[PDB]
Amino acid sequence: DSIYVREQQIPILIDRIDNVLYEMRIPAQKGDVLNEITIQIGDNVDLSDIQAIRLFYSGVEAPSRKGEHFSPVTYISSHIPGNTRKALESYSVRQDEVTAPLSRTVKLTSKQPMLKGINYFWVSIQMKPETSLLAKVATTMPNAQINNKPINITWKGKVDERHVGIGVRQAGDDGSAAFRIPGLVTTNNGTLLGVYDIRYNSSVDLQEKIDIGVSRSTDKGQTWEPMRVAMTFKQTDGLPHGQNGVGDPSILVDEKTNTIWVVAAWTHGMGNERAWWNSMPGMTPDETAQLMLVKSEDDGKTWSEPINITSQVKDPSWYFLLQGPGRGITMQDGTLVFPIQFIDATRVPNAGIMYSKDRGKTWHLHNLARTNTTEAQVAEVEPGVLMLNMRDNRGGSRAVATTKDLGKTWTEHPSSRSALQESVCMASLIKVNAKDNITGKDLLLFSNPNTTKGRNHITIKASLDGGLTWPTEHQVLLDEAEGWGYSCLSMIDKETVGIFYESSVAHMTFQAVKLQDLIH
Template sequence: MIKFVFGLFLWCGLYGCNSSCPTISLRMDKQVAPVFIRQEENSVLHIQVDNTTDKELVLNKLVLSAKGTSRIEAVKQIRIYFTGLNPNFSSTVLFGHTQDAREVNTFKGQQALKPGINHFWVSVCLSENALLSDKIHFTCTDATLSDACVVVADSLPVLSSAVGYAVRLRGDDQVNAYRIPGLVCTPKGTLIAVYDVRYNSAVDLQENIDVGVSRSVDGGQTWLPMQIAMDMGEWGGRSHKENGIGDPAILVDPQTGRVWIAGLWLHGNPGKRAWWASKPGITPEETGQFVLAYSDDDGATWSEPINITSQVKKKEWYLCFQGPGMGITTQEGTLVFPAQFKDKNQVPYSTIIYSKDKGKTWNIGTGARSNTTEAQVVELTDGSLMLNMRDDRGGSRAVMITKDFGKTWTEHVSSRSALPEPVCQASLIRIHLKGGKPALAFFNPANTQGRVHSTLKISLDEGVTWPEKYHTLVYEPGSYGYSCLTQIDSTTLGVLYEGAGELYFQRLNIGE
């Protein structure tokens, strides 16, 4: 939370000051979060007016400055809401609004202020011509009481918000929730996002869930209508709700242009969570299925499902499936997906699956570390693979290295210390900086207590250290916490991350 407490002075109106004129303090803060295209309400400023008297006062004017906003025409509407003594945002009580955003915006009303700290929230809605490169700046410059006493700030700090894109909002296409993001940038520059389409509720498999796809051909500025890439229909005589498929991971092969999606399909077991419903065996009636689909036209169309369960799962295991997030293609052309399995004792392990023949056949590695699940994989400069894992012990990410595609593993020096987490999925990718210098980028809720403070971190030494000077807080509020990074060009990363049942996209400048 960015907070500013101003030195204030009280200016009395036309009829002069008197001893009854109260002294009012005004504070402002904001959470670090973008303003999202397609989202109706975007909080950009929190104003706190402290009524230190023992009686109600009336505030009848607030003035907001948008000076520093890159393009004021990007803002379609500004609203100010009053939440009384409740410090949480709500759009119930409207103090004032404008449909015509300007550099200076005046809002008039008659709002009673009870003794104590009274809360106002500034919310904006962006216009259709808003750009992801825009910056939105707002600060409060004036607050007027009905008795003509005016609160004026000595200094006017600018509170800035980036612009993002709400790729999927709850209710889009009559869907209850969208979860589990994956993201790649193809050799043609197309961004392909995959995710769970959770029709009925936000809960995990088993439910009526398909794997959806959204595509952008302009770097994330706009997104084409949603497609369904993986849908098991009414297989085996059971309903869609008993043939859910989800938790996708996506992989692009730059050598062929083919894009792969991996998904977990669960057959039967209505209302039971896949993690516990899946049993030993190989068939759909027994256990969760490891399923692939591919596209040869930059994600415009997708193949029929390809079931590789018998290739990668041991019969005695309870479950075997992908990442989720994204996979990689190594320099030598091997396709690699992060994966996980529950062994015969129901102990989970992170691992990888890989194909050395462009997806015709698949193999699986051994478990990298017990009690680890959702992982991401990158290739290091020496050709070894780094597996960065969600660790059920909590506290920090586990990191292991393999030089033989998962036959053997060694612990990395950063494991269980360098990357704090609240037990959650995360994103890790290799990026290429200007001049060809290699680096790693990591994104997760960087907090051990909860899924808050989603943060981008950069490492210039193969993940040994993640210096604080290369940390960027991207999304401060609480969320479901999952994310996926991709590199768009030499200066820009893209990240797709979860809100609460919604999916947000943001461009991040590597230099910044």
């Protein structure tokens, strides 16, 4: 008899009741019993952070299912509204449980007689809610017993150390079916502000009833204040809220004043279809998507009424002008900058940037950085040099360009279409100055689904040479599984980078990673 066990590098949410530590598949005969397994927690793990460890039985696999798998269903949902934190009772039956205080070796037992075929068991770990976001969970499963006889385990995936995280927003929270399109900044007071679409009815893009929400943390992501609606258009002009959506937020901190700016696209009318195919040439809300700004002058607690800046930057011939989701920046000289994207008169989308030299009162947009590109993020790679990292519809890899004149003229970067692979998805890029971090060196930090197939392997990558190279040694995989893929980075302090992203375990997931783990 054989036992196949897989561990994936997926976040252990501190706010979840269950977290999939290990999944086990056992091709067995009728009557077989997994009488015992041993979980050996690592010596460097802080045992006092662990609330519980559980063994679950999840029945048998269907003969009709194609391929080989490690579960018959997703054990813990990130989709079912209001039921995303605890193991789905429909599909898993608890065999055993060890609760706090945990010792270094944990033995879990079962009396379950298996059925003939592929049987599934899995191990759950529960962390205490106050657990440090920097805590790591190293474990192994050195022993397993079937019918009281030792069985050697066949490993089909193993991780050195697991990371924790917090599901800031989950399916169904505050009556919203979904949350998407992450943006993250750290204010001058060290406050973390996470921005996103509040996708009330479904996970689809505009047009739909969508508002801009903001979650605020004053303790580096350990706890998040109740969600605030930063922007909404409700029943503007008498149209239903479903035909008055605002979405795809981008957030920036004016670092000279601590004023926080969020830009989003308001779509008006356009039925229940996607706004990408219904925003048309013109300027009015009836004709085209509206570029809207809100500001906070109290560290993200309260937000101004929306400010319509469409007329300042949209050409009438364009079908659609909107921000690139995620974040914007303050340049060294105090210039505020947001990435943008527009569908031109020839129906081709293009990435670029808009900026303000007067603290966000007036905005300017020059020329496109590259044709057939969409979502992009901007970083000041060197003083007065903006680097734009772009979602490229050609597929396979991020396009990269720079400008020294705020986007009048652009230069393709050596790393463009070669250094950073992608499946055509949003990606995050930030600059970290040597003075402001523990490595004492300038850094670019990038995050995306690190693959050309689907959206998985959410990874943070660091560059020490202005984005020319991204060494494998200086990367950290955070989410091996499939998700919606968008992410946004921001330095929490001098020693830690924060990532606010769409993961396999939560719609808005926050994680903290030490820079010492990335570099060194």
